[PDB]
């Protein structure tokens, strides 16, 4: 949902208060990738165990 | 209906066309060089002709 996937593009192109929302979309989005990766690894940890 | 540790009233006068420059993280002549309002401004802004 951000204007760009790169952090520097948001901080450089957009203003600070506009970056607070756009950078948060990358944070909230990428945190789900970690939560999904960690969740799958714990699930695979049960299979390998 | 709430208490506060300290309340500071910054008193100054501006023109009518300059009222839009005073805001969180807003640019302008009186905003960027005289009084830049912080992004986490938890205070109040009052105006009167």
Swiss-Prot record, chain A:
Effect on the protein of changing residue 11 to F: In strain: Omicron/BA.1
Write the protein's name.
Spike protein S2'
Taxonomic superkingdom: Viruses
What is the recorded function of this protein according to its Swiss-Prot or TrEMBL entry?
A: Subunit of the fusion protein that is processed upon entry into the host cell. Mediates fusion of the virion and cellular membranes by functioning as a class I viral fusion protein. Contains a viral fusion peptide that is unmasked after S2 cleavage. This cleavage can occur at the cell membrane by host TMPRSS2 or during endocytosis by host CSTL. In either case, this triggers an extensive and irreversible conformational change that leads to fusion of the viral envelope with the cellular cytoplasmic membrane, releasing viral genomic RNA into the host cell cytoplasm.
Q: Which gene encodes it?
A: S
């Amino acid at each position: 949902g951000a204007i760009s996937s790169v952090l520097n593009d948001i901080l450089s192109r957009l203003d600070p208060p506009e970056a607070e929302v756009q950078i948060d979309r990358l944070i909230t989005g990428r945190l789900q990738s970690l939560q999904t990766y960690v969740t799958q690894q714990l699930i695979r940890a049960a299979e390998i165990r | 209906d709430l208490c506060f540790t300290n309340v500071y009233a910054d008193s100054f006068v501006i023109r009518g066309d300059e009222v839009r420059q005073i805001a969180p993280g807003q640019t302008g002549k009186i905003a960027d060089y005289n009084y830049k309002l912080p992004d986490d401004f938890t205070g109040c802004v009052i105006a009167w002709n």
